[PDB]
Every structure is written in structure tokens, then in C-alpha cells.
Symmetry: D2
Subunit: 215 residues, 4 copies
């Protein structure tokens, strides 16, 4: 499933991120806001049960109980994903966190990359309950989707109940590459951009998340 959250407020933030005149302080600020928001959207796609509670006025009433909110694991890719994950964690107060330090080897070429090398420098993940936990992986950008598929190689084994991928911008090439391999993955993103340049950068994109966040 592909959820493109393009509501006025998320598109308003995306425009601040895209704008090159935005400094890293405000850039990181929005990522935290968007992870907050995107987290809410994801909340509304979870499994809920119909329950009954008694109000103060003795009256019994029917309400919902999203049992899944107690089975969430958010994996942080680090780098630009930190402000984002900081936002998601705000929305899922009961989520455990894991980190899979992934970074693609940025190559310069004469053609548009359809694939890139990805190295993993750090790995600390919580136990993932099979058929129970909902895993959320954050990545500000998805270009060739090489970074994402690399982290997935492992997450997918755990066989979590669900798998969500949050990103700000995704390239058409990337969404299709990921969802054609794991179409069961709920992929959230505020927008999808057309192409990748010869360095594997999304166009129009927003630049190098890492550079925008800590430059």
C-alpha cells in the first residue's frame, strides 16, 4: 500500500524543507513536526478492537482500543532520520527503538543509478515479536531504494505483523522498486518525485538530508 500524505499542512512543511534557504535548525524542526504528523496518519491504519468502558456517570459505552499501539518497533537509520524518528516516537509513546546504521556508497556516474552499495555500520534492534509487532522504518529520502531494501533484508525475516516505511520524498523508481518486492509494506510519504540525477539524487528533491540537517 502507498499512502501519499499530501494535505495542506504536510505540503506546507515539505515546502520549507525543499527551500534551500532553510537552515538546519528549521530543517530539523520540520522533520520532527512531519514525523509527528506522519505518525498520526499511520495510527489511523492500525488494527483496532471494539471495546466497552464505563463512564463516570455509571453508563456503559462502546469505544475503540488500538491494541497495536503496544506493539511498535521504530528503526532509526540515523543521520537525517533522527529528527524524523524523534517525531514518530512522539506519536507512539510505547514504541521500542532499534538502530540499523545504513549508508549508501555515493558514487558519481555518467548514468542514473538503479542500484547502489549499502554498508551497515551499527545494529541494535529490539526483539521483534513475530505476527505481533508493527515495524516502522524512517528514511527522509528514498531514491534508488537501495538503503531501504538493505534494512528490509533483515526486518522482513523477523516476520512482523506489519511493516511501515516513512519518508518525506520518494522517487517513482524507489516506490515501485520497494513495493514490487514487498507489496505488503505500507509505504507513507508526503510526496513522490519523478527522477534521479546521475548522483542518485531525487529531483526536485531537497538536497542531501544529511547536509540540510547538519550542514
Amino acid at each position: 500500500p502507498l499512502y501519499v500524505i499530501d494535505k495542506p499542512i504536510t505540503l506546507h512543511i515539505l515546502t520549507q524543507l525543499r527551500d534551500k534557504y532553510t537552515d538546519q535548525i528549521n530543517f530539523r524542526k520540520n522533520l520532527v513536526r512531519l514525523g509527528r504528523i506522519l505518525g498520526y496518519e499511520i495510527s489511523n491504519t492500525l488494527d483496532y478492537e471494539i471495546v466497552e468502558v464505563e463512564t463516570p456517570l455509571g453508563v456503559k459505552t462502546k469505544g475503540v482500543d488500538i491494541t497495536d499501539l503496544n506493539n511498535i518497533v521504530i528503526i532509526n537509520i540515523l543521520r537525517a532520520a533522527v529528527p524524523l524518528v524523534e517525531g514518530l516516537l512522539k506519536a507512539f509513546p510505547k514504541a521500542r527503538q532499534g538502530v540499523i546504521g545504513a549508508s549508501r556508497v555515493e558514487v558519481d556516474g555518467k548514468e542514473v543509478p538503479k542500484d547502489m552499495d549499502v554498508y551497515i555500520y551499527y545494529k541494535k534492534i529490539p526483539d521483534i515479536r513475530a505476527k505481533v509487532d508493527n515495524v516502522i522504518i524512517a528514511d527522509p529520502m528514498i531514491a534508488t531504494a537501495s538503503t531501504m531494501l538493505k534494512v528490509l533484508e533483515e526486518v522482513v525475516k523477523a516476520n512482523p505483523k506489519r511493516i511501515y516505511i516513512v519518508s518525506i520524498i520518494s522517487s517513482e523508481y524507489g516506490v515501485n522498486k520497494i513495493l514490487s518486492k514487498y507489496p505488503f509494506i505500507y509505504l507513507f510519504t508526503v510526496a513522490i518525485d519523478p527522477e534521479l540525477n546521475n548522483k542518485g539524487y531525487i529531483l526536485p528533491g531537497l538536497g542531501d538530508a544529511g547536509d540540510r540537517a547538519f550542514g
Copy 2:
């Protein structure tokens, strides 16, 4: 405009609020959450506009710029409305705040009328820029709407650009009264409950907002 925000997450928190076994800490904690979510939703009804921004990759693209995020005044009626206004202020960083104290007229009798006058003992409100500001009045529960009415008479004279009313549970009698008298108002709420018992409590409701929050 009536906007009932009955999504899985909001109703989940609402269930939490109704449940009589939810202590005051968690009760307020959830009230803050809803202010955030209810604020997010309010944002998407805001008046935006299309702009053009240049990204780091030299490409220029179109985006959104919700300028009304600068012209916002949130009015806090105190009491249990505090945790709520707190979350709404987090959803509107550039929003100014005003507060008002109010006590409805105490007329001899154990029973309670539905149309009572209200005494506004304290009133501190930022200047409401005519035709430019968007006023948001926060109030946990609208049972009889006597207070909402008293306040609205004041805000109206200011000639806002838009007026919003946020609440968790709002009695059917209340919605009707407010919207029928002021049709142009955006009244957001997580749920509209049926009746009001003689004591004026919303049924099933969630008890006394104030006592749940600071009891």
C-alpha cells in the same frame, strides 16, 4: 461547518477519557494529545496558497504556503481546557493566546437549565485582527453551550477571519445551538453525544472534565 474527527486514533484516546479508571495524569496526558491531533486536522482546513521554491539541486518547483499559520489566536477558557489548549498551541507555534474566566449564573435549585447567562470575570485576549485572524476557542466539552455562546458574542464583534470551536465530546443540543446561531463557525469535535441529564452532564460523556483532570 461541523467536522467530527472520528478516526481510529482519536476515538482510541476518547475511550481512554471515558473509561472511569483513567487517573488524572493519563487523563490530562491524553487531553494534550487530542489538542495536537485536533490541531493538525484544523490546519488542513486553513487557507493556503501556491508558491514556487528553489531547491538545492537548482531546480525550482511549486509548493504550498499556509500563511494563516501566522494569524492565529487560541482562546483558553481555563479549567479542563488547559491540557487541550496546550496541545493546540503545540500544533500552532506562532499562535497567540488569550484566556477568560467564566462562571454561569447560579440560580436557586438543584436542577440545571440549558440556557443560562454566564459571568466572564477574567478576560485577557490578544488583539483580534479584523478579517485576518482565525480564532480557535478551546473547551473540552460543550454540554449546554451557554459558555461558548457568551464567549462567541465577544469574539464575533472582533470580526475574525474564521472562528473555530474544539471539544472532545459535544452534546447534540450544544452543536445545534451553536451552529444554528452562528452557521459560519467551524466546530470540531471527536464525538457528539445524545443527551444531557437534568444535572446538565453529557451522556454517556466522561464525567466532570475538571474533576477528571485535576481531581
Copy 3:
């Protein structure tokens, strides 16, 4: 006892609060900050006990457990105290909040006020456990000490283990008045201004708190 918290950072904030040019968004922004830092300072004055915990390395070591952090009740006198309490609760996660819509009566100015009338509109407070709970009462200003003494009147009969008063600015008259009656109160403030005018406003002080925060 009197605790004047004049650490470089607190005085920095205060300078912002006193500055008549500080707008209400920043005014309240600073009050939340100051509430955090003061709750921190306050937390250090609390009673604690030596314990023993087991590190993952299978090694016991002595430690500190501030047991009272689970027995705190913050009393919000509302209005301009709001932002300040918002900050204090951030330092005390497990604290129960109570509210008191108290407000001294504006005087004529024909005589130097000593004992002012205090109206009590609303009052919802948690069960204060005698000899166990530590009560924290917050009000940004303390001039004639009337609003506070009014509040204390009740808090004392509850026989708490400790009573803490927190503010930004206190007057000499007020600190002595409160402390002459209840010498056991732990009174925190960032500054003690020397005089009150005839209207009951601290000089140089910082103006009317409510108007600064909600004007």
C-alpha cells in the same frame, strides 16, 4: 527557607520576562523554560535515600532514589501560572496537578496594601496525603503575598510533608510575610525586588503577568 535561584541562565530568562518589549509568545515560552529549570532546582532540595541497584555487569553499587518524586502535587493558581506549571510538570512526570482560580482584588491605592481580598472562583485539588506528599504552589508573582496566603490557608490544613512555593519575582514584604507565618515553607524565586507600589505591583518587577502572557 528562602531560595533565590540567580544562576546565570535563570537571570537571563528573567531579563527577557522583565523586558517590556518581550511579546506574549516569547513571554510564555520563557515561563515554561523557567518552570523546567526551577523544578530541577527544587527537585535537588528533596529528601532521598541510599539504595542498591544491579548493573547489567552483575555488580551492585550504591545509589540515590528520590522517593518523593512519586509524591508531588503541583497546584496551579491558573492564569499566568499556567505556562510556569507546564514547565514544572516537565520536571515532575509523576506529579498530580490541582487548580485554584484565585485572584486578589484590585485595590484603590489610597493606602499601601498589606492584606488584599482574594476571590476563589474554581477549586479542584487531588487528595493530599498527609506526611507524605510534597505540595508545590506556583504563581509567577508574589507582591503582598495575599493570593499565596489565601491558598496556603487550605494547603496547610492538609498537613503535607513539605510545601514549596515557586515564583519568578517576589517582594521583600511578601517573602517575609509568608515566611513569618510559615517558616517551614520552601520558598523559591529567581529574584526579590525591593518595593511594591500602592496598587500592589512589584517594582521594577515585570508588569501584570496575565497581560504579559495573554495580552
Copy 4:
């Protein structure tokens, strides 16, 4: 300069971290917390000046202005430091963040050398202004100081007006290895532990910050 910040509130937080039973969510929560506190203490050593501000009462008064609050760069060396930096960044709203990913050297032999090389694979740091910016480098635990030394050797090259190192626990060894090479570095820690066991673990320490925060 060595600053051991062992106040009741910080030791209380430290005690929880050392306690093996503290779950991951709570472990990271405390890091964020110690981060704002340590941030508060650091803020009192920053350059500041006396200024004249006029209050609403129409009278001028002196105050403090910590101008150095606009010249802070925080360096996130990732890993278990994410929670800590998060807190630090709250204490310094105007701080710019930079990141540098570092990994230890593969060294066959169960035992871990006191001194060892460190590979820095990612480095994105804002423009450190010479003799102006204050560089804060958070790192939960300094055992062998190997990572800190590697990172310092880079940071120092920019001639920062000042360099701070914030850590929860630090071994005597590491403290001596840092200050012995750079005695001008402000090394803030909550507790210094005696020895390091053969696996590079501080004793009593608190185990592996990575597994404690992400496991």
C-alpha cells in the same frame, strides 16, 4: 577542567540507568532528561554580560544576557548518544547540530585495548566559527576514550572558543586520557567509575548503552 555534576537529582537519574531492570524506553527517557540538566549546568559557564532592560512599570533595571547562547554547536556522535543530544538540544534551542559516525577497529582477541584506532565514516559538521563557537560533544560513556580522542583531533582543528564533553559515566582512565591531552576541555560528567573490565566495560558502569537504549 573536570566538572563532576553529582547533585541528588542527577545521581537519582543515574541510579535508574545503572539498574539493569530499567527498560529501554525508560533508559532513553532518562538520557534525554540528563541531557537537559547537563545542558542547564553547562549554560552557566557561558560568556554573558550585564544589560539594561526597562520593565512595564517604567523603570530601568540590570539583567543578564548570555550572548554565547547563539554560538553553540552540538556534535552527535550517534549511537546511545541520540537521546542525550536530544536533551542537550532542548537546553540550547539556537544550537546547531553536526554528526559524525565512528566505528571501532576489528581486533581479534576477546580483550579490548585501552587505546585503539577509530574509523570515522561520516562527518557532517556545521561551520565552527573560530574562537566564537562552543562545541559540545555528547557521549554517554567514556570508557577507553578512544572514540572521543579520534573525534577531538578533528574538532580541535577548528579553533572553537570552547569545547565541552558531556558524559553520564566515565572511567578514571578515560578522564585522565582526555584532560591529559586537552586540559582546556570542559569535561562534564555525573559520575566517574573506578575500573574497566577486560571487555572495555566501565565498572560498575551501566552495561552497554547501545543494548540498554535500543535493546
